[PDB]
């Protein structure tokens with residue numbers, strides 16, 4: 250860390266998490282910028298194995314819609330992960346509160362989100378924490394899936410396993426996480442993509458949690474799309490949301506069928 254900081258300026262904090270923080274590092278000579286995730290392993294006993302997993306998963310990734318991993322190094326009880334600096338910031342800050350963003354921008358980001366998710370699923374990795382705060386943008390507004398601290402392997406070669414960890418950010422979690430002891434990985438990530446799409450189109454999350462005790466979730470199950478956030482959403486993207494935000498994960502739309510959706514394929518302004 251000491252020789253690195255002699256040549257690289259840790260200009261500012263980019264973000265904070267339970268792990269620690271992400272800093273913007275700029276080389277004094279070349280002016281190259283790198284995001285440096287700093288993790289204090291002392292914050293948990295499981296942390297060395299946890300960060301080893303995030304590092305291991307990061308080593309497997311190579312795709313245009315996934316944040317590039319350069320390497321890592323341990324300095325005492327501190328872990329340093331070196332990542333592609335995504336200068337467009339978080340997708341979250343492209344979302345105007347209670348408004349969202351223009352429909353063509355939401356469509357383009359959603360296509361890039363699907364490309365990234367198809368790639369992860371194809372190598373047997375599930376993210377488990379898809380949300381606008383974990384979707385970054387590069388200097389050309391290309392979406393990059395970020396933050397693999399909760400990611401895990403769901404398929405070993407051509408053999409799937411069921412997951413059982415109640416993972417992620419509650420307004421983004423699929424209802425089976427509160428109903429089933431074990432469940433398929435891929436429909437969980439599909440559900441969270443549907444929540445991201447809802448947020449991009451309406452600038453609002455539809456519910457605290459997808460429970461029958463949550464009124465807003467009951468309203469959706471009852472097709473009350475004349476209520477917020479749904480009433481702000483045009484019928485074409487809402488028809489896709491009706492297929493994604495399906496309670497039973499076995500009846501939920503799969504990504505190959507999202508790719509056949511009319512709004513997904515719709516040429517917009």
Ligand SMILES: NC(=O)c1ccc(N[C@H]2CCCNC2)c2cc(-c3ccccc3)[nH]c12
Nearest residue numbers: 263264265271284332333334335336338382
């Ligand atoms: N690899 C990066 O570039 C990076 C990694 C994590 C980042 N935050 C974390 C915060 C917790 C939730 N998940 C994201 C940011 C935030 C920024 C940024 C860039 C440009 C402008 C404004 C913010 N960049 C990053």
